[PDB]
Every structure is written in structure tokens, then in C-alpha cells.
Amino acid sequence: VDAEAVVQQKCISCHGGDLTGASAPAIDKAGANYSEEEILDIILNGQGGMPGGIAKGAEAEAVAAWLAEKK
Ligand code: HEC
């Protein structure tokens, strides 16, 4: 899975092109604040103002792993 391409397709409309926040909060350092599993749960299911379902399965897991290393 190309995790960065997925994030640019699916996440930047709310989180900003460089992930530093736009309508929604920054995620560029999400791994400093969340575990990989917490990030996966957010992607699959949403959280607070974020909807669920935006990515699934291996795509979601690859994005969670990529973000979890960003600190
Ligand atoms: C707007 C329709 C969104 C899209 C598209 C995505 N996210 Fe989001 N996200 C959004 C909001 C409004 C919030 C805040 C909810 C909260 O209280 O935390 C979030 C939050 C996150 C978080 C947790 C907080 C943080 O790190 O800032 C993460 C890790 C996150 N979002 C990731 C994420 C990814 C990877 C997305 C693309 C697959 C994605 N979000 C899309 C709104 C929206």
C-alpha cells in the first residue's frame, strides 16, 4: 500500500496538505500522541468530529503504521 498517496487522496481535505491542520487538527506528529492501534481505530471508526469509514483494511493499517512513526 502506498500510505502517503492514500493520505494525500483521503485525509488532506480536513487535515491540510502537509498534515499540519486545516478545518480539522494537525496529524503530522500523530505518532507522538497516539499508538498505531489508536490511529487505526480512528481511521476505521472515526472519533469525535471525524467520520468513520474513510479507509479500510490493509489501506487503513498501512496508513496507521505510517502515521504512528511520525513524531
Ligand atoms: C474531515 C471529513 C476528515 C477527514 C477526511 C479525515 N479526518 Fe481525521 N479528523 C477529523 C476531525 C474533525 C478530527 C478531530 C476529532 C478528534 O477529536 O480527535 C480528526 C482527528 C483525527 C486524528 C486524531 C487527532 C489528531 O491526531 O489530530 C487522527 C489521527 C486522524 N484524524 C487521522 C485521519 C486520517 C489518517 C485520515 C485519512 C484516512 C483522516 N483523519 C481523514 C476530520 C477528518
UniProtKB/Swiss-Prot annotation:
Post-translational modification: Is a lipoprotein in vivo.
Binding-site residues, heme c: 11, 14-15
Predominant location: membrane
UniProt entry tagged with the keyword Flavoprotein: no
UniProt GO MF annotations: electron transfer activity; heme binding; iron ion binding
Compartments, as annotated in UniProt: Cell membrane
Topology versus the membrane: Peripheral membrane protein
Record-level GO cellular component terms: plasma membrane
Keywords annotated in UniProt: Cell membrane, Electron transport, Heme, Iron, Lipoprotein, Membrane, Metal-binding, Transport
Record-stated family: Belongs to the cytochrome c family.
Role, per record: Natural electron acceptor for a formate dehydrogenase.
Protein name per its UniProtKB record: Cytochrome c-553
Organism: Sporosarcina pasteurii (Bacillus pasteurii)
Lineage: Bacteria, Bacillati, Bacillota, Bacilli, Bacillales
Span covered, complete protein: 22 to 92 of 92
